[PDB]
Design a protein around this ligand. Structure first.
Ligand code: AKG
Ligand code: FE
Lengths: 220, 20
């Protein structure tokens, strides 16, 4: 759908009012299916590795998050439609310039292609960016055709600050999701009992990201 | 309190930022 209208008339007001925005049927069945095949090819060729945490301590990462992931730039052979998804996400964000809170969004991470391989895997309650590493917006695309959350689980539960209800997001095929990455939106991925795929991109605030890079380049 | 960075999903901190 046209990026300008979607961004300014739905995403921006929804994010500023609620900090969470769901766009269903983002790319259509055909494109969503091609993305799914590309993700399943990465899975089938051994590209995924255990999901990792910002700060690693005595504990195992699998006690925290049970997914396996790979990072995709978008230009790799066999990832062309993932690149199209990424470009489509970027297009929406560019049309939001200066309208999402006070942030100045000039960059993003690579795409995290993520798989919870059933077996009850999930992600304990967490904040995506609790310590100011530059991430301001989390963007997720789901590609689980035939997902029945009542049996297979995998619901993303967000606890938006200051709300009388939490937000339950089923990992529905062709669903696009935005939410603030900071402490306003603690969230958890509830156990998945079937193979669950998503693609995650984080968008950076320029000023916060610059401060985070300074801290990294000077030894914290 | 808990150090929430021990639960936060990892991202590369240098050399992998995409410019829009
Ligand atoms: O897959 C999801 O719904 C959310 C993933 C998530 O919370 C993360 O990787 O930080
Ligand atoms: Fe998260």
């Amino acid at each position: 759908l046209p990026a300008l209208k979607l961004a300014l008339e739905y995403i921006v007001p929804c994010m500023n009012k609620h900090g969470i925005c769901v766009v269903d049927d983002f790319l259509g069945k055909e494109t969503g299916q091609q993305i799914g095949d590309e993700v399943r090819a990465l899975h089938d060729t051994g590209k995924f590795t255990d999901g990792q945490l910002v700060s690693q301590k005595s504990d195992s990462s699998k006690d925290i998050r049970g997914d396996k992931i790979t990072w995709i730039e978008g230009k790799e052979p066999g990832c062309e439609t993932i690149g199209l998804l990424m470009s489509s996400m970027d297009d929406l964000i560019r049309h939001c310039n200066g309208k999402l809170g006070s942030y100045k969004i000039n960059g993003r991470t690579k795409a995290m292609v993520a798989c919870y391989p059933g077996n009850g895997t999930g992600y304990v309650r967490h904040v995506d960016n609790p310590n100011g590493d530059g991430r301001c917006v989390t963007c997720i695309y789901y590609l689980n055709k035939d997902w029945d959350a009542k049996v297979s689980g995998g619901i993303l539960r967000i606890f938006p600050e200051g709300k009388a209800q939490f937000a339950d997001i089923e990992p529905k095929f062709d669903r696009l999701l935005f939410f603030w990455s900071d402490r306003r939106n603690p969230h958890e991925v509830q156990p998945a009992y079937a193979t669950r795929y998503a693609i995650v991109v984080w968008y950076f605030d320029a000023d916060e990201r610059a401060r985070a890079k300074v801290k990294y380049l000077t030894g914290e | 309190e808990l150090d929430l960075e021990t639960l936060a999903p990892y991202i590369p901190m240098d050399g992998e930022d995409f410019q829009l």
